[PDB]
Amino acid sequence: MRYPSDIVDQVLKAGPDKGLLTWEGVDAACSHCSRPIQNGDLYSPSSVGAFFSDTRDLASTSRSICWRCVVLRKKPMLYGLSAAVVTQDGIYSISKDVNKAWLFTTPPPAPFLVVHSSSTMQHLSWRTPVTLDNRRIHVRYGPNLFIVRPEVVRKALSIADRVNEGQKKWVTPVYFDRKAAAMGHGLITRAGAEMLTQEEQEFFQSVTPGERWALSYLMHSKRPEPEVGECITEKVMTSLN
DNA sequence: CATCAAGCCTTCCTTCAGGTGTTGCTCCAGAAAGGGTGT
Ligand SMILES: [Zn+2]
Known part of the structure; x- marks a missing residue:
């Protein structure tokens, strides 16, 4: 649960x-995990093709992918976690x-791991840290x-x-973009400007951009009651095996 | 050759026409995985 690649062996x-080769010499961190x-741990020379665009989120320049990140870089494990949270018991989907x-x-109170795609498929899971505490989600x-605070x-x-309350039409205080891409993502609406107090406007400005992105999926009009995603770890295990 | 009248009045705008149609966006911003083939 210490590294994201622990969703390959533990879960x-x-x-x-x-x-895969066996590591020798002084220990080096994995480029992805x-x-x-360490010595005696299975690793691969980094055979990433030229379509790999996540060099900026590589952890190290060792050019050595750990076997757990080789499983993490599998395409069924790539698209199978396009919207997922990986707790210690199983993988759940956050598409809805x-x-x-x-x-x-x-x-959930587990040391989970939240991965979501802004596109069709991205090298997504290895570059993000594990959320050990519930109140701070990576x-x-x-x-x-x-970074999201529940x-x-x-x-x-x-x-x-x-x-x-008491309004027939549900009006949002602040517009948030699901893609987190619009210029107005974080811009407060004029109904929100005329309604919210200045302390609350500075509160909605004081949240992290991950919280703005999350609130975009949960400030829409048909307000979502918190419901657990269906467990997809059997699905992505079958797709992997 | 000098004034002496060296204007007066009253008109002093009228009627509609005083838009119509159409455009009113398009697309993509993935990256293995399985095949080739070219040095
Ligand atoms: Zn690694």
Whole structure:
């Protein structure tokens, strides 16, 4: 649970592909896992093709991919975790907005790992740290790393629900972009500007951009009740094996 | 050759026309994995 690559042995159980070399000499960290490849640990020379665009998120320049990250770099394990949270018991999907409501309000207490895709398929899982504490979640979204606090998320939800009590039409205080791509992502609306107090406007400005991205999946009009995603670790284990 | 009248009045705008149609975006921003083949 210390490194993201621990979702290969502890969870989504798999072994080395056995065409891998055995590490020798002084230990070096893996280029993808950030895990130290010790002596006697299975590793591959880094045979990444030219379509690998995640050099900026490589942990080290060792050119040595650990076997756990070889399993992490498998394409079924790439697209199978396009929207997933990997707890210690299994992998769950966060594609639905109710699933992100369960992820970002009352999250599971495990040292989980939140990976999400801003595109069709990205080298996504190895570059993001594990969320050891529940209150600080390291989300990976596309090319960016994101930090989400569940309690501040519930505070923003309480404010957003409170400012729309007694109104027939549900109006958002602040626009947030699901792609986290618009210029107005984080810009407060004029209904929100006329409704929210300045302390609450500075509160909605004070949240992390990962929290803005999360609130985009959970500030829409048809407000999502937090519901657990269906367990997909059997699905991605079958796709892997 | 000098004044002496060296203007007066009253008109002093009228009627519609005072848009119509159409465009009113397109696409992509993946990267293995399985095959080739070219030095
Ligand atoms: Zn590694």
